[PDB]
């Protein structure tokens, strides 16, 4: 619970050091001039408040990264006793920081020679002692243990002896001070390589890169210069071991001297020297050195300096401005600035781990969710189809597991949008048709509730008006409270329920999207940035959550040079806790007091939501003593990635309370891979059955295909040539009507063809017929109309078949083509208003084609691809390293089995990333994770054999 950024005791000590020493003018001679920034004064710009403040953050930082490192398999440098930087405690870190505040208080000048050095640090240790002396009544009891303790840290501020490696307290305070010099000294490569190697010895290589990484962000947050790192820097390298240099003379070779059994040996740090012929070694020459390339990550790398997004002119402005002064003067502001920067460096590394998002928006329906919402809609519309253990629609039997699959694979927030107020109103009709019993989630000794009877009577008394808007609130209200409902709905939704009836699974599948829709329409409140959620769980099951949470926090680190993204990706894909708040309308509050106090929660999910993703809707009315509740249906590409895991006191039942703080992160890497067809394929068979009835009825209601009636109208056409009728009428039948009956005869007689479809279009309209006055043309039309309904009846019958043929083999695209064949009206209006049942179907497929296939390799084919190569290379290098493992005793073998246990998990991640980044219709190439899996089975039996050997050698020994 301790932190530099939120401890008034630590900040008070800082305020003191500022008011008295750091904030007072430099009474020294050398470089003690006052600095101006934006029209505000800062007496000590180099070693002022911003200086001693950052250094404290470093301690916080280095200890965090150190503790993260140990959470990985890493072994940190031990001191005289078996303690590492990661063994530093919250109390000890407070002493370190308070000590660290006065570490530059004794400064009078900016002078840098040994005499001034001893003097100023002489004064600094006193200032500390003085401050402690003043507030001994509040510190020495609890903050410190005794005067011995205070003298230890005061001794360190003095630095009489030159040791800085002695203990954690010593290393932190000294490195923290020296690393803050990165923002000033001018061979950035030379210094950085130096400071890196220094910290790498105590904390680790990855942990260090995180440090200087988050260190650049502290500079930007405190308005100090962020230097770059140019691998190709051609300026003269400066050896930091003193102020020496490296030299190359005659032959382009660096000067050396060779001792015993070393071949060529270390470089002669020619101090600064005057030469020739001879030339000093450049930064790039140093960086390309075989010594440096294999030990320093920054070789060949480049870090852009200044600020990204602004030129160096407008950067200079940002450096010489008020906040640069407010930082050096305002202690509260400076802490906040770092605080947010540090807290930021905990999120951004997670974003970098996965491929980028775009907008916060919820996704768009795919085929299955479109068809899904159709089914739900009809169920609410026609409750009659609901049975004891299944729902029947258009001859399709929808079992239990289907509605479970519908809850598992369908973005229910998205299905809810496809529903309407009419579908809300069908809750009343749905609840009338039902008089079944909902049960409690656990609490087997609980009163069952008739859900149908409860709803109806709920609306009679509370919804006197029947107002549709209200209904939604009532549905939402039914959601909160009534643990005879939400207990079963949530337990079913997340597939962690037991002994559930079909009526309970069915209604959950329906009430979920409806409730979500009700929430979306209702909530007009601004989306909160911070939500809290409480759960009751066993201390041992919570123990497993803390480990999974610690895995992700441990392997996600800010970047400097080398990219540790793939590994963070892996660890998060392995321990992810997001699917605990998904698949259902999880309820949350905005006020902590409701989870801590009222409900006495042992586990609290603090969910940070600054980017506004995770759209959460208000529930009930908020106020003083209200729940202040918000529902959240977790989006399928949004994950809740843990940033911190804190212990906060205990509950009423004595057990410790853990508060996990998560952070919403949207990325296509989180979208679940679901095989489509789970809700649409039944829906296609449904529509095919609906057409089968319309086809059958039409096939026997109007029928028969008299061929003779065509022959006559063909004989009559040739017969009206000698009729003394019009000159045009004789031409209309011979030239216009003649050929139509020509093709109509070929089509009907010879198979189907598009001939029947095209001929049906050549049929003269009623308008063309009327323009032949009134006469024996009327007797011609009713003959013609009789013939049209013959061709039409056939084409409409072949279209229903060829369409039904589609649906059988899916091809929802091909089905619609046929239905575009059916004639409309004046071409075909001899079939009754089952035209309605037919247009209703083309309308069902018009909407199924409005599918959106959302992408998972949404760009960053380079990130997705590159990231994969790192993982497989890593995992393969972990398996081959275990491949030739010395198994001396039983301990080495025990370590190997758990290794293999973890590698087994890794390779499947390798597998899914192959699947998820693969495109096309062909065999997914697994050739590489095959060679790995085989290695696994090899070192599975190797250990299992060598295990029994050791367990036997152990019982042998014990006798």
């Amino acid at each position: 619970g301790f932190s530099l950024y939120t401890d008034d005791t630590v900040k008070a000590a800082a305020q003191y050091a500022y008011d008295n020493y750091l904030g007072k003018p430099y009474t020294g001679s050398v470089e003690s001039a006052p600095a101006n920034f934006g029209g505000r004064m800062v007496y000590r710009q180099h070693h002022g408040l911003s200086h001693t403040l950052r250094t404290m953050a470093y301690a916080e930082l280095i200890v965090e990264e150190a503790r993260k490192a140990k959470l990985r398999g890493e072994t940190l440098g031990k001191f005289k006793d078996g303690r590492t930087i990661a063994d530093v405690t919250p109390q000890e870190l407070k002493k370190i920081m308070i000590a660290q505040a006065f570490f530059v208080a004794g400064r009078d000048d900016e002078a840098s020679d040994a005499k001034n050095y001893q003097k100023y640090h002489e004064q600094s240790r006193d200032a500390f002692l003085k401050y402690v002396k003043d507030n001994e009544s509040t510190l020495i009891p609890d903050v410190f243990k005794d005067q011995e303790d205070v003298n230890f840290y005061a001794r360190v501020i003095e630095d009489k002896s030159h040791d800085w490696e002695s203990t954690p307290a010593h290393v932190l305070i000294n490195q923290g001070h020296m690393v803050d010099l990165v923002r000033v000294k001018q061979p950035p490569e030379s210094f950085l390589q130096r400071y890196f190697s220094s910290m790498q010895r105590w904390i680790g290589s990855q942990a260090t890169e995180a440090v200087f990484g988050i260190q650049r962000q502290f500079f930007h947050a405190t308005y100090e210069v962020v230097a770059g790192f140019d691998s190709d820097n051609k300026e003269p390298h400066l050896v930091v071991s003193g102020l020496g240099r490296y030299v190359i003379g005659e032959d382009g070779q660096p000067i050396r001297e060779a001792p015993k059994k070393g071949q060529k040996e270390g470089d002669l740090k020619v101090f600064p020297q005057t030469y020739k012929n001879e030339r000093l070694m450049r930064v790039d020459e140093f960086l390309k050195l075989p010594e440096i390339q294999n030990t320093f990550p920054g070789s060949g790398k480049h870090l852009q300096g200044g600020m990204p997004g602004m030129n160096e002119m407008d950067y200079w402005n940002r450096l010489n401005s008020l906040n640069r002064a407010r930082c050096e003067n305002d202690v509260d502001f400076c802490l906040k600035q770092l605080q947010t920067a540090h807290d930021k460096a905990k999120i951004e590394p997670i974003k970098q781990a996965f491929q980028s998002s775009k907008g916060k928006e919820r996704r768009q329906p795919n085929v299955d969710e479109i068809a899904a919402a159709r089914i739900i809609q009809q169920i609410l519309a026609n409750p009659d189809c609901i049975h004891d253990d299944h729902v029947l629609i258009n001859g399709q039997k929808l079992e239990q597991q289907f509605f479970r699959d519908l809850l598992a694979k369908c973005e229910m927030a998205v299905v809810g949008s496809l529903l309407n107020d009419t579908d809300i109103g069908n809750i009343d009709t749905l609840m009338r048709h039902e008089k079944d019993t909902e049960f409690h989630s656990t609490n087997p000794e609980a009163v069952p509730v008739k859900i149908g009877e409860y709803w109806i009577n709920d609306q009679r008394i509370n919804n006197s008006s029947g107002n549709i808007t209200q209904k939604k609130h009532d549905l939402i209200f039914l959601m909160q409270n009534d643990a005879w409902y939400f207990s079963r709905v949530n337990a079913i939704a997340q597939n962690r329920d037991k002994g559930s009836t079909f009526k309970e699974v069915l209604i959950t599948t329906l009430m979920t999207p409806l409730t979500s829709k009700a929430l979306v329409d209702t909530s007009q409140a601004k989306p909160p940035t911070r939500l809290f959620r409480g759960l009751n769980l066993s201390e041992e099951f919570t123990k497993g959550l803390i480990d999974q949470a610690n895995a992700m926090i441990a392997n996600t680190t800010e970047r400097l040079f080398t990219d540790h993204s793939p590994e963070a990706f892996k660890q998060i894909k392995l321990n992810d806790l997001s699917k605990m708040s998904g698949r259902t309308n999880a309820s949350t509050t905005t006020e902590i007091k409701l989870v801590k106090e009222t409900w006495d929660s042992n586990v609290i999910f603090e969910m940070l939501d600054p980017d506004g993703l995770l759209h959460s809707k208000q529930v009930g009315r908020h106020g003083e003593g209200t729940e202040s509740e918000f529902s959240v249906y977790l989006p399928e590409d949004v994950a809740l990635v843990p940033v911190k895991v804190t212990l906060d006191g205990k509950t009423q039942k004595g057990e410790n309370r853990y508060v996990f703080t998560f952070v919403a992160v949207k990325s296509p890497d989180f979208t679940p891979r679901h095989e489509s067809g789970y809700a649409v394929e039944p829906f296609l068979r449904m529509q095919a059955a609906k057409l089968a009835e319309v086809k059958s009825s039409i096939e026997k209601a109007q029928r028969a295909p008299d061929l003779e009636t065509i022959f006559n109208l063909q004989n009559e056409v040739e017969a009206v040539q000698y009729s003394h009728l019009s000159t045009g009428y004789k031409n209309f039948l011979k030239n216009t009507v003649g050929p139509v009956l020509e093709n109509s005869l070929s089509g009907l007689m010879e198979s189907d063809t598009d001939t029947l479809s095209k001929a049906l279009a050549a049929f003269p309209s009623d308008t063309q017929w009327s323009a032949f006055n009134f006469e024996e043309a009327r007797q011609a039309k009713r003959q013609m109309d009789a013939i049209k309904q013959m061709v039409g009846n056939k084409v409409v019958l072949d279209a229903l078949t060829q369409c039904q043929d589609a649906l059988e083999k899916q091809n929802i695209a091909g089905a619609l083509d046929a239905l575009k064949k059916i004639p409309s009206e004046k071409e075909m209006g001899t079939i009754r208003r089952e035209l309605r049942e037919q247009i209703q179907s083309a309308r069902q497929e018009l909407e199924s084609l409005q599918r959106a296939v959302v992408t998972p390799v949404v760009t960053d084919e380079k990130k997705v691809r590159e990231r994969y190569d790192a993982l497989i290379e890593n995992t393969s290098k972990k398996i081959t390293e275990l491949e030739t493992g010395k198994l001396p005793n039983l301990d080495a073998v025990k370590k190997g089995i758990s290794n293999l246990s973890n590698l087994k998990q890794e390779v499947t991640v390798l597998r899914n990333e192959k699947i998820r980044m693969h495109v096309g219709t062909d065999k997914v190439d697994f050739s590489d994770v095959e060679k790995l899996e085989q290695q696994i089975q090899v070192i599975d039996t190797k250990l299992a054999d060598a295990y029994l050997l050791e367990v036997t050698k152990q019982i042998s020994a014990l006798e």
Partner: protein, 77 residues
């Protein structure tokens, strides 16, 4: 005796009972008794072919249950 069918553009079918060998002129008179149409104003059409009064039904290969198309020719016999 065989029965054949005669149609009009107006829309009425006429049924006639006749034996083969009868002439077209003879069939025209049979229409006269049935539907009061003068033989002078008749054109018989079959299979796109116009029947002359001298030839029998057997010549045009008209057979039982066949259909004919009667048209009224005015200003001519």
């Amino acid at each position: 005796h065989m029965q054949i069918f005669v149609k009009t553009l107006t829309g009425k079918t006429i049924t006639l009972e006749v034996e083969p060998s009868d002439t077209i002129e003879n069939v025209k008179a049979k229409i006269q008794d049935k539907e009061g149409i003068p033989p002078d104003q008749q054109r018989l059409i079959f299979a796109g072919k116009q029947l002359e009064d001298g030839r029998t039904l057997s010549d045009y290969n008209i057979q039982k249950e066949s259909t004919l198309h009667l048209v009224l020719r005015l200003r001519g016999g």
